Amino acid sequence: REHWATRLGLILAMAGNAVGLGNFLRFPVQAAENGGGAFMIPYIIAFLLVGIPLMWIEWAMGRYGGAQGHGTTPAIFYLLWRNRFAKILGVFGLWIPLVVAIYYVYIESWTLGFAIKFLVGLVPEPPTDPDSILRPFKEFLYSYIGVPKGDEPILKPSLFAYIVFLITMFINVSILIRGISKGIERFAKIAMPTLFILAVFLVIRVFLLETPNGTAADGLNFLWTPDFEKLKDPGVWIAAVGQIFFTLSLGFGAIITYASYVRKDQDIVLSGLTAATLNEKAEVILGGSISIPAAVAFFGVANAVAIAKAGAFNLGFITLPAIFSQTAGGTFLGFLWFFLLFFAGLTSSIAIMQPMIAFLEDELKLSRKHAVLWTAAIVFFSAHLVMFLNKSLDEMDFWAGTIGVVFFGLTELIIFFWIFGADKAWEEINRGGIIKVPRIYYYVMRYITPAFLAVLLVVWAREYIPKIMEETHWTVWITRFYIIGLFLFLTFLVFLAERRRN
């Protein structure tokens, strides 16, 4: 089996997996919609009671299976639990990261296209009226991805966006095709430091923004000023948990796959904690101190919150660059922003495609070259669905990137810490660890976490089961139909891999 060269490269590769678009786009939106500081309390708690324990759990499961030559859940779920149904559940460890990858890589190609256009200086040019400043950039984005005037089902991506997507795929391939140590690790040691530098620079530059409408300090205050009136709102807890799952790459089967390349004897405790810690630092300190403070600086808190609620991409691709264009060298500053997003996304995209690649290598015994090329072909082809079908992206991000990750997170925890045995799991986690997991986390993993997630899923299911059936748009049905087809396809591959063994 292939292994990580150094401990540092391992940390940066894992950090690269977690730290991504979720930090600089998803988080700011989530924190702003839930009342800033009010969102921080449930967020930290969710990080302690869910993020950390699951992180360690995924690392352990990854290394455990990796020792036997299996990096994907279909095989690992079977090693921990002997059953056909264990393999079927394991299919999600491929389905989720593949589905997510389909639209994630497209969003990534956006930041690249924007990065390129902002570098060359091809951007809209605003003249004191907020709408007259934002409109040009809204029209810019809509011209790029091909947004319809009314609410029409069809998208019309510009030739450029399409070509940029091809290029993005090519970049993802050139990195993945070189393997774990030569491809991902090498790039991690570069991308990450660069990412951190750009982030710090942007945070500082943004912190210097002060206008008659407010300052960046007002945004930092808003985000870090506690509010206990929102602690009774379940939605805030749900959003915080969802964010923790998405930002830490939990339930994507990505962490497990990456962990399967960790030598059986190497530590996974201190390594995992470091990766997760690096992600939170990059999330709350960096990600939360760029977008939000900037919007609050120019448009004040009320408007900033309004803009955050407006959409997930509205703050990142429209509002922020619009704000920069009003400052000296704002065009180049926008370039740095989109270059930051691109690297963060690139380090993450290669992580959610790896599970698929690792399954082809491990279970179907395909060479690394073929596995990567086929995985790229699949994602690229499937991507057309997100490119040309409106609301398709949201559907995939919901079923896979929201509901699926939590369900899968609960499933993997139940399989590892209950069925496989709590003591055996605990001993497997601490084995070879430079430091040891606090004894208390044994009862967080076994009791607190699964209960919290179970409750969360029940609540979710109750609200979504009626809405699903009554949904007018056909685009969403096509999407559901197709992703379901993907699931069958993967289940069929798992079947073939199972027969080859015999």
Ligand code: MET
């Ligand atoms: C694409 S890996 C899962 C998502 C990633 N951790 C992010 O926050 O962007």
Ligand code: NA
């Ligand atoms: Na990343």
Ligand code: NA
């Ligand atoms: Na993250």
